[PDB]
Design a protein around this ligand. Structure first.
Ligand SMILES: Nc1ncnc2c1ncn2[C@@H]1O[C@H](COP(=O)(O)OP(=O)(O)O)[C@@H](O)[C@H]1O
Ligand SMILES: [Cl-]
Ligand SMILES: [Cl-]
Ligand SMILES: [Mg+2]
Ligand code: NA
Length: 378
């Protein structure tokens, strides 16, 4: 090819290519190392990635996201039935299969989850192609360890539809381990804990690695815990602030709320490297601008319970793996949310001071490992 490694994420996707013994995590047209798993449909065009998420606040009904939550599932699926209630876009039943229904060029159209994901994969593929200046055909696509055969088949199908020859579908936690070279043979088995706190889901896997063979010792997590929940706590905090200073409640203005949410998500990232972040939105509500700031401490306070709750699934996993804290030789951070200093502290404290593998951007670790494995399979 070369073959590329693609992390098709719930909220953000990432692509990397292994060349000259090094992995290149490829930046998109906007210079972003990860790309939103969004697709939007309008009267005139279909948008994918950044372009799609950038207009989600004004086109909520025809901007699709969270396709990964539907992929490979039946319409009757209790989780599908639950999730549907929270999405602004429509999900219909087509012969027992869920399809998202949107308006595109004035006409009603429905897409299978793999079709939406194929669009996201197409974007990732083109991102790699612009960098490589060559056609990308072969790829390794990652999936959560919990995915069943249907979910995996559907993920592979999305790749096929995107024009990719999926060399192999591998687990995200295994990919993260590969990224750190933990798959290299050393004879004696090693116990690795993958702590993945992403944009929408939280997952922990305990793997036992002996001579490159990955033995999943245990798994645990929360399919509904991620960075978006942290943005939320900030949103409500600022809705209260605006209401105090301006005696106006923006809660019912869908667009104002989405704009504030974006501002919060951004401030949140800055808070991972700075102890303070500024928020300056123009024409937030009724021509009123919202210029404010938030401290790391405040952000931590607003999310204290959520942050700490991540430890329960960790204890659970260890217990199920019939392993003690001390038996974990490596702790790998995955997911953009593990970049939050407070999260790292909680996890380290829990592991009594143990160092965390975090040199590779957590939100890129999956793609990184996938890129390495793709090279190996090529
Ligand atoms: N520097 C950072 N600090 C805190 N949160 C971050 C940072 N960078 C990204 N995030 C958050 O990480 C989440 C996305 O994680 P990512 O691993 O890229 O996606 P996914 O979970 O879909 O695989 C989002 O909630 C995003 O806001
Ligand atoms: Cl792009
Ligand atoms: Cl390393
Ligand atoms: Mg992820
Ligand atoms: Na991702």
């Amino acid at each position: 090819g070369p073959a590329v490694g693609i992390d098709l994420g719930t909220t953000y996707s990432c692509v990397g290519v292994f060349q000259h013994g090094k992995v290149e995590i490829i930046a998109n047209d906007q210079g972003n190392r990860t790309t939103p798993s969004y697709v939007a449909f309008t009267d005139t065009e279909r948008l994918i990635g950044d372009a799609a998420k950038n207009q989600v606040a004004m086109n909520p009904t025809n901007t699709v996201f969270d396709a990964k939550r539907l992929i490979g599932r039946r319409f009757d699926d209790a989780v599908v039935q639950s999730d549907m209630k929270h999405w602004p876009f429509m999900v219909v039943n087509d012969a027992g299969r869920p399809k998202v229904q949107v308006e595109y060029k004035g006409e009603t159209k429905s897409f299978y989850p793999e079709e939406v994901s194929s669009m996201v994969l197409t974007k990732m593929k083109e991102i790699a192609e612009a960098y490589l200046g060559k056609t990308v055909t072969n790829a390794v696509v990652t999936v959560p360890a919990y995915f069943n055969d249907s979910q995996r088949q559907a993920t592979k199908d999305a790749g096929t539809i995107a024009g990719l020859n999926v060399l192999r579908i591998i687990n995200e936690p295994t990919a993260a381990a590969i990224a750190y070279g933990l798959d290299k043979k050393v004879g004696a088995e090693r116990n690795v804990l993958i702590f993945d706190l992403g944009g929408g889901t939280f997952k922990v896997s305990i793997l036992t690695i002996e001579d490159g063979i990955f033995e999943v010792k245990s798994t645990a997590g929360d399919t509904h815990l991620g960075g978006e929940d942290f943005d939320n706590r900030m949103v409500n905090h600022f809705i209260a602030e605006f209401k105090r200073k301006h005696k106006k409640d923006i809660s019912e203005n869908k667009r104002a709320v989405r704009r504030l949410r974006t501002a919060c998500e951004r401030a949140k990232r800055t808070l991972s490297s700075s102890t303070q972040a500024s928020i300056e939105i123009d024409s937030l509500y009724e021509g009123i601008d919202f210029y404010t700031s938030i401290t790391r401490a405040r952000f931590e306070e607003l999310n204290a319970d959520l942050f700490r709750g991540t430890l329960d699934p960790v204890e659970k996993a260890l217990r199920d793996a019939k392993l003690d804290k001390s038996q974990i030789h490596d702790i790998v951070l995955v997911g953009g949310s593990t970049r939050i200093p407070k999260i790292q502290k909680l996890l380290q404290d829990f592991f009594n001071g143990k160092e965390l593998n975090k040199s590779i951007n957590p939100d890129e670790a999956v793609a990184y490992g996938a890129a390495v494995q793709a090279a190996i399979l090529s």
